[PDB]
Paper text:
We determined the atomic resolution structures of all functional domains (I-III from N- to C-termini) present in the three S-layer proteins [name]_ac, SlpX_ac, and [name]_amy.
The N-terminal part, exhibiting the first two domains ([name]_I and [name]_II), is known to be responsible for the self-assembly of the [name] into a regular lattice. The crystal structures of [name] from [name] and L. amylovorus and observed crystal contacts reveal the self-assembly formation. The self-assembly region (SA) is formed by domains [name]_I and [name]_II, building a 2D crystalline network that forms the exposed surface of the [name] layer. Furthermore, the flexible part of the N terminus (aa 40 to 49) traverses pore 2, very likely further reducing the dimensions of the pore.
Author numbering: 32 to 42, 49 to 65, 70 to 194
Write the structure that this text describes.
């Protein structure tokens, strides 16, 4: 360690997490809104697709003011939504067992909730230092992405 750092986070992270979400607004003569997407991570020049606990009700959309889940069916154009994906994990493989890594995103709107390498819960943080398990898996309580807009088509 030879590098001056007055911030809590290491240089500013070695795993770039990239959620790609597509929100489609409902129509007012009715077209049901939809929301779909995946989560990708870069690590040691490789891309990895995130694994989820469930294929159903594995994420929650919220408008501001309210913790109340918004039906994908009744998304509105022009409203800032936050998407909170639960029980996210990455399988970085057995060759990466036991490595300590920092998760971050080049997207400011992305936050993480999970257990860090010092075994503390952190909520809605821009970076999380985790220890990969004996199989090279990183587990997260959730990943949030803010300022998702449903597009009118």
């Amino acid at each position: 360690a030879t590098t001056i750092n007055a911030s809590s986070s290491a240089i500013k992270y070695d795993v770039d997490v990239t959620p790609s979400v597509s929100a489609v607004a409902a129509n007012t003569p009715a077209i049901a809104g939809n929301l779909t997407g995946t989560i990708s991570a870069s690590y040691n020049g490789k891309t990895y697709t995130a694994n989820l606990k469930a294929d159903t009700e594995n994420a929650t959309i919220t408008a501001a003011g309210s913790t109340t889940a918004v039906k994908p069916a009744e998304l509105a154009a022009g409203v800032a939504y936050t998407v909170t994906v639960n029980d996210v994990s990455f399988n970085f493989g057995s060759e990466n067992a036991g490595k300590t890594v920092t998760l971050g995103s080049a997207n400011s709107n992305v936050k993480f909730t999970g257990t860090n390498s010092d075994n503390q819960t952190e909520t809605n943080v821009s970076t999380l230092k985790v220890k990969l398990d004996q199989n090279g898996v990183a587990s997260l309580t959730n990943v949030s992405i803010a300022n998702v807009y449903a597009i009118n088509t």
